[PDB]
């Protein structure tokens, strides 16, 4: 292996060795002491405890994560990031780091719990962890951290995706988890103004409930957000049929009707005038 042929974009010096037997991997709960400089000026001082791959939402250069993913237990060192592996072109305000800049990072990796890989865990474990993760996805969400919530609910769809050595009991326990995941994803996306993704998640979910109140609903909100009135009308009109006493379904269904007839009226008068104009133009003989 020994990938690292990012041509020294990411380089570290083991200031202080430190026991260690294994390294932090994808999605691992890392506890770390951070010190990063530009030119030689300090912009970041703090001891963050985050999940690897979560760094983007925590003002940390892409490169800094792959570096950490190559440390010991209580190891110390420093990372020198070439422009392409740290805020790069977009630079980074609130730290005012001009585009195409380099960085210096002095990081001390304390503890860390590696993220179990799909292969490592048997049927039940996947279900347990699928739970542990969702719990988090839940917190991050009610906390307004939608992107990080995404990170969580996804791990679930991942782990449970292939593996099917599930007893009929776990088969549906896991299916519930999946459905839950997809519904929650759609929820985040809508928050994130990512309506295409919202709709793709509703579909993955309705492939599991095709009657689901939330999926059918959330998909109507997404169509409606991007002026997909007709498609929306369809989803709200259907949610009502399956759940008459559904609050927003009725109102939203109304919005569609409104926007649709006004739309109709508009495009009607157009052809009307377009028609007239052709006539007069045709009369020219």
């Amino acid at each position: 292996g020994s990938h690292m042929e990012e041509d020294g974009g990411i380089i570290r010096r083991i200031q202080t060795r430190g026991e260690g037997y294994a390294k932090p991997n994808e999605g691992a709960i890392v506890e770390v002491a951070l010190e990063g400089y530009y030119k030689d000026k300090l912009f970041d001082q703090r001891e963050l405890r985050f999940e690897i791959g979560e760094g983007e939402n925590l003002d940390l250069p892409y490169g800094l994560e792959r570096a950490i993913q190559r440390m010991e237990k209580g190891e110390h060192s420093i990372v020198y990031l070439k422009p392409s592996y740290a805020f790069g072109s977009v630079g980074k305000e609130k730290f005012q780091i001009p585009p195409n800049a380099e960085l210096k990072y002095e990081l001390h990796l304390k503890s860390f719990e590696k993220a179990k890989e799909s292969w490592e865990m048997n049927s039940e474990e996947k279900l347990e962890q699928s739970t542990i993760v969702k719990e988090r996805g839940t917190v991050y969400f009610k906390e307004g951290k939608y992107k990080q919530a995404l990170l969580q609910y996804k791990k679930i769809v991942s782990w449970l995706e292939y593996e099917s050595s599930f007893s009929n009991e776990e088969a549906q326990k896991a299916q519930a988890l999946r459905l839950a995941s997809h519904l929650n994803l759609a929820m985040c996306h809508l928050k994130l103004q990512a309506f295409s993704a919202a709709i793709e998640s509703c579909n993955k979910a309705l492939e599991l409930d095709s009657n689901n109140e939330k999926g059918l609903f959330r998909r109507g909100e997404a169509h409606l957000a991007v002026n997909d009135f007709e498609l929306a009308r369809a989803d709200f009109q259907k949610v009502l049929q399956l759940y008459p006493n559904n609050k927003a379904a009725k109102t939203q269904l109304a919005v569609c009707q409104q926007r649709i007839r006004r739309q109709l009226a508009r495009e009607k008068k157009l052809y009307a005038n377009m028609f007239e104009r052709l006539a007069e133009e045709e009369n020219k003989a």
């Binding site: 839940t138 839950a180 519904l183 929650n184 609050k247 927003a248």
Partner: peptide
């Protein structure tokens, strides 16, 4: 749990 609405 999932609520809100």
């Amino acid at each position: 749990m999932e609520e809100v609405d």
